[PDB]
Design a binder for this molecule. Structure first.
Ligand SMILES: */C=C\C1=C(C)C(=O)N/C1=C\C1=NC(=C\c2[nH]c(/C=C3\NC(=O)C(C=C)=C3C)c(C)c2CCC(=O)O)/C(CCC(=O)O)=C1C
Ligand SMILES: */C=C\C1=C(C)C(=O)N/C1=C\C1=NC(=C\c2[nH]c(/C=C3\NC(=O)C(C=C)=C3C)c(C)c2CCC(=O)O)/C(CCC(=O)O)=C1C
Lengths: 151, 152
């Protein structure tokens, strides 16, 4: 009931806190999709008094049009410097509004469905993400997806 | 920093053990780290409800010392709902009984191709019918621990 949900919430939030300190990333969050693939930042660990985006609602028109279909088979984003990247203007603008300079975003699956994104943000300088860090983030997303599949 | 790399790995493994024990409602959750001779020590533990702690216990398990955990590198793991119903060596049954174990899951932690340790869940109050997703959850947490351990 509400007990199940409190238990999942605490586990997922602990993973976010865990991974943010271990990876030493400025901000780590979990973005959960609504039915229409709008979504909300529902867990967040941000260091040192920096910009919190917890409970921000986002209508990302890439996810809302694709329903995340491209994110179902190990696909992901890892950008060392969003200034350099050949990003869509509208996506660059979203990232800029939330102070992102470097990002890794991996999908969270509930069964065969895209449930959310697990996203690491640097807020000031570029970051050359390592293969192991991307694998760590993906494998923590698997952990989360198994726990989420129980409610 | 050799001091801070070890400290950050310690904080991460201790956080996983503490919160996974509460999430699965396990009586005792352990990380057993192997020495070069495949003796080992319990180096992280979350225990609740006034159950005996085995943190820092040294174990010379003669199965792991004789096999060097090779079977645990080729898909062996242990998931027993009630050790009273299982076929065990009396030596291994004595180990579990000493520490009040009634139900157990034990999965490998790898560092590259080497068996680094075991992630073990003990039920002490009662037998427990482990669900497929709980065994998968423990295996996948052991994967995440392995990736972190591989960095130092
Ligand atoms: C309709 C314009 C528009 C608004 C408004 C908006 O919020 N986004 C947006 C357009 C595009 N988004 C594109 C890609 C994209 N969005 C995300 C979303 C997030 N990353 C996070 O960390 C996070 C949180 C936390 C969110 C909500 C991600 C990960 C991507 C990259 C998708 C891949 O390209 O992999 C995008 C470009 C689409 C493309 O390149 O094909 C546009 C136009
Ligand atoms: C040399 C006699 C002897 C001593 C002493 C001892 O500690 N064990 C032991 C004999 C055997 N152990 C056997 C299998 C086995 N050991 C472990 C070890 C642990 N489980 C934990 O939870 C934990 C901590 C915490 C430790 C150190 C495990 C997981 C196994 C099972 C191996 C599988 O079957 O998968 C064993 C084999 C016979 C049997 O399994 O009963 C003997 C003889």
């Amino acid at each position: 009931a509400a007990g199940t949900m409190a238990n999942l919430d605490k586990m997922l939030n602990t993973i976010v806190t865990e991974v943010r300190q271990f990876l030493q990333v400025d901000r780590l969050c979990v973005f959960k999709f609504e039915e229409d693939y709008s979504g909300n930042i529902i867990y967040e660990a941000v260091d040192d008094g920096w910009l919190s985006i917890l409970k921000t609602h986002v209508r990302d028109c890439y996810f809302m049009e694709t329903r995340g279909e491209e994110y179902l088979h190990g696909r992901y984003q890892a950008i060392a410097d969003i200034h350099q990247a050949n990003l869509a203007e509208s996506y660059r603008d979203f990232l800029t509004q939330y102070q992102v300079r470097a990002i890794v975003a991996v999908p969270i699956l509930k069964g065969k469905k895209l449930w959310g994104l697990f996203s690491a943000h640097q807020l000031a300088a570029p970051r050359s993400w390592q293969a192991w860090e991307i694998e760590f983030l993906k494998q923590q997303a698997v952990v989360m997806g198994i726990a989420i599949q129980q409610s």
